[PDB]
Enzyme design. Structure first.
Site, PDB file in Angstrom:
ATOM      1  CG  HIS A 177      -0.585   0.209   2.497  1.00  0.00           C
ATOM      2  ND1 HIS A 177      -0.250   1.458   3.002  1.00  0.00           N
ATOM      3  CD2 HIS A 177      -0.521  -0.699   3.501  1.00  0.00           C
ATOM      4  CE1 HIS A 177       0.057   1.261   4.277  1.00  0.00           C
ATOM      5  NE2 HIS A 177      -0.078  -0.025   4.622  1.00  0.00           N
TER       6      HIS A 177
ATOM      7  N   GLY B  86       2.109   6.094  10.212  1.00  0.00           N
ATOM      8  CA  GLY B  86       3.519   6.011   9.843  1.00  0.00           C
ATOM      9  C   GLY B  86       4.232   4.753  10.333  1.00  0.00           C
TER      10      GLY B  86
ATOM     11  CB  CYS C  74       2.418   0.982   7.438  1.00  0.00           C
ATOM     12  SG  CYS C  74       0.718   1.394   7.892  1.00  0.00           S
TER      13      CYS C  74
END
Ligand SMILES: C[C@@H]1CCN(S(=O)(=O)N2Cc3ccc(Cl)cc3[C@H](C(=O)Nc3cncc4ccccc34)C2)C1
Ligand SMILES: C[C@@H]1CCN(S(=O)(=O)N2Cc3ccc(Cl)cc3[C@H](C(=O)Nc3cncc4ccccc34)C2)C1
Ligand SMILES: [Cl-]
Lengths: 302, 299
Positions: free
Chosen positions: A41, A143, A145
Site C-alpha cells: 500500500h 507512519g 506501517c
C-alpha cells in the site's frame, strides 16, 4: 524470580529498518541482503485505498519512483516485484548488518516482539500475541506501517509479522513476510472488523504454571476435570477450546510442578467462577494470555 | 491506537555486553571504550579491598562474543569493578552515566554469560527496588534510557531480595536504596504507588478512548494528598502537577480534575471495569513515557 512480559533484544532487527517513500506516502521497510520488503500500500493514495488495483498502480511505476533511505544514505532501487501484499524492492547494496534469518508464518496464540518504527527509525520494542481473531493488540500510530514482529530463538531472527493497518476497534492487522494476511483482512479501506476475540486458554494455563514455579499455589484445588467438561465451561467465558495438542504441549510444565494438566484446568475453571477476590497472580488481577508454554520455560528456567 | 509497556530499542546496549569470569563466579559486564564495568562481587562479610589486592589482571577472564579481551588494569569505584582492557569497544555508543530517582522508568537488557536474552521496561520503586525478572547469572545486566542518540546508563543489577524483587547500583557503583552487596539479612521496605505515574496512565487511557472514570469533580492538592496517604500512594507535589501540564492541555482535563477521578477509583474500585486492559491502577509509565508513546519519538 519475577515474571515480566519480555521482548527479544531488538538489535538484529534495528540494523534492517529503512524508510521507503513513494510519492507522498512514507513508511518502513525491512532490508535483508539486497531486498527491501514493505507493505504494497506504499504505492496507494488515500483515495486508492477504497478499491485499489495494485497490479495497475504498480505497472505505472519505475525503480526511481521508490526512494529508500537507510540512516543517512539513499539506496538505489534496481528492481521491484509484488508478492501477495508485500512489495519487494531490489536494491544495489546488500545490508552488511543482515542477521541470520527465516520467514515463519505463526498461528494464533503465538507471541512475538514488535519493533515499532517511524520514518525507518526504531522507537520502541514490545511483546505481543497473535490473537485467536488474527489481530494483534499493538501500539501503533500513523507512519508505523512496515514495522515488524519477530522471535530470536538462538542467533536466528524469525520474521513473522509486518504491520499493514489499524482496524476500527484500535487493533492491528498485517501479513507474514511473504505478504499473506493473518485473518480475513484485505489491504483495502473496507468495512471489515475484527471477529469476536477469545482468551488463549493454553497460554493462561502456562502462566498459571509460571505462578506455581515462582511459589504461588493459592488458586489450586483438590479437583480434576475431563477435557470435554473443561471446554464446555471455558467456552462460556469466551475462552478458546483446549485441544489434546495443547495438553501435550503443557506436559513439561506439568512434570516440573507435579500438577496434571487437567488438575490445572480445574483450577482455571474455579478462577473463572470466583474471580481473584482481591488477590493477584504474578502481579496481575486478570488472567494473562500473552505467554506461551515455550515463553514460560524460556523465562522461568532459561 | 494501543498502549503497551514499551522498552527502548536495545541494539546500542547489546554491542556493549561481555561475560566476566573470576574464579568460579561468572556474570555480565558493560564494555564502553577500553573499560569493562561489572559488580565488584565477581571477586567474591567481604573486605573488597583485601579480596581485590590478591587478584592480578589475568585472574579476570573477559569474553566479547567469541573473542577474549585481555585485562591490563583494574580498580574499584564504590560497588563497581572497572576492568581496563587492551581493546576499545568499536561498538561504543554515545553515552552518559546518570543516577535516576524513584518513579523514573528504564529499559533492562537481561543477559546471561554476556549474551542478551531479553528486554523489558520497569520502574525504580519508591522503596528503591525494581520488580524485575532475573535468574542466577543475570548480575551485571543494565538499565538504560535513550534520549536522541545518547544511551543514559542508570542501573546495574547486583542482587535479588527475599521477596523476589531486585537491588542494584548506578554505573558509579552507588546502590539505589539501603542495600549492601553481601549475603546478609536485607529486605525491601514497604512500597508505595507512584501517583504521578498513575495519573499519566489515566491521561493515556483518555487519549486512547477510555473515559468511564472521568467525573465532573475537582479537588485541592492537599485534600488529594490526605486521600493518597491513606491508600499508600506517594504524595503528589506541585512539580508533579506542572509535569502533567501538557497531558492536561491535550485532553482538556485539569490535573486536579484527574486527581478527583483517581480519588473515586481508590475509594470505590473499578466495579468490574478495566482501564487500558488492566484491573489494577498502573504506575510504571511516567508522564514523559505517555507523551513519547502517544507521539512516536524515534532513536
Ligand atoms: C484508524 C485509522 C482510520 C483510517 N485509517 S487511515 O490512517 O486513514 N489508513 C487507512 C488504511 C487502510 C488500509 C490499509 Cl492496508 C492501511 C491504512 C493506513 C493505516 O491503517 N495506518 C495505520 C496503521 N497503524 C496504526 C495507525 C494509527 C492511526 C492511523 C493510521 C494507522 C491508513 C486508520
Ligand atoms: C535470592 C537468592 C537467595 C540467595 N542468593 S544467592 O543466589 O545465594 N546469591 C547471594 C548474593 C549475595 C549478595 C549479592 Cl550482592 C548477590 C548475590 C547473588 C544474587 O542475589 N543473585 C541473583 C540476582 N538476581 C536474581 C537471582 C535469582 C536467583 C538466584 C540469584 C539471583 C547470589 C540470592
Ligand atoms: Cl506458531
Amino acid at each position: 524470580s519475577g515474571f515480566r512480559k519480555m521482548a527479544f533484544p531488538s538489535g538484529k532487527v534495528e540494523g534492517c529498518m529503512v524508510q521507503v517513500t513513494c510519492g507522498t506516502t512514507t513508511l518502513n521497510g525491512l532490508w535483508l541482503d539486497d531486498v527491501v520488503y514493505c507493505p504494497r500500500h506504499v504505492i496507494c493514495t488515500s483515495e486508492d485505498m477504497l478499491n485499489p488495483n495494485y497490479e495497475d498502480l504498480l505497472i505505472r511505476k519505475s525503480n526511481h519512483n521508490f526512494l529508500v533511505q537507510a540512516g543517512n544514505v539513499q539506496l538505489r532501487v534496481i528492481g521491484h516485484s509484488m508478492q501477495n501484499c508485500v512489495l519487494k524492492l531490489k536494491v544495489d547494496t546488500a545490508n552488511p548488518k543482515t542477521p541470520k534469518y527465516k520467514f515463519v508464518r505463526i498461528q494464533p496464540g503465538q507471541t512475538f516482539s514488535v519493533l515499532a518504527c517511524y520514518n525507518g527509525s526504531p522507537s520502541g520494542v514490545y511483546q505481543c500475541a497473535m490473537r485467536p481473531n488474527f489481530t494483534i493488540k499493538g501500539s501503533f500510530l500513523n507512519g508505523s506501517c512496515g514495522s515488524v514482529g519477530f522471535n530470536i530463538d538462538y542467533d536466528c531472527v524469525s520474521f513473522c509479522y509486518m504491520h499493514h493497518m489499524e482496524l476500527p476497534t484500535g487493533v492491528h492487522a498485517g501479513t507474514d513476510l511473504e505478504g499473506n494476511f493473518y485473518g480475513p483482512f484485505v489491504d483495502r479501506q473496507t468495512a471489515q472488523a475484527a471477529g469476536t476475540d477469545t482468551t488463549i486458554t493454553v497460554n493462561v494455563l502456562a502462566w498459571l504454571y509460571a505462578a506455581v514455579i515462582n511459589g504461588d499455589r493459592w488458586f489450586l484445588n483438590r479437583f480434576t476435570t475431563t477435557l470435554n467438561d473443561f471446554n464446555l465451561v471455558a467456552m462460556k467465558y469466551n475462552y478458546e477450546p483446549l485441544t489434546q495438542d495443547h495438553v501435550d504441549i503443557l506436559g513439561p510444565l506439568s512434570a516440573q510442578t507435579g500438577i496434571a494438566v487437567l488438575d490445572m484446568c480445574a483450577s482455571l475453571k474455579e478462577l473463572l467462577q470466583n474471580g481473584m477476590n482481591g488477590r493477584t497472580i504474578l502481579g496481575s488481577a486478570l488472567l494473562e494470555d500473552e505467554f506461551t508454554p515455550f515463553d514460560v520455560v524460556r523465562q522461568c528456567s532459561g
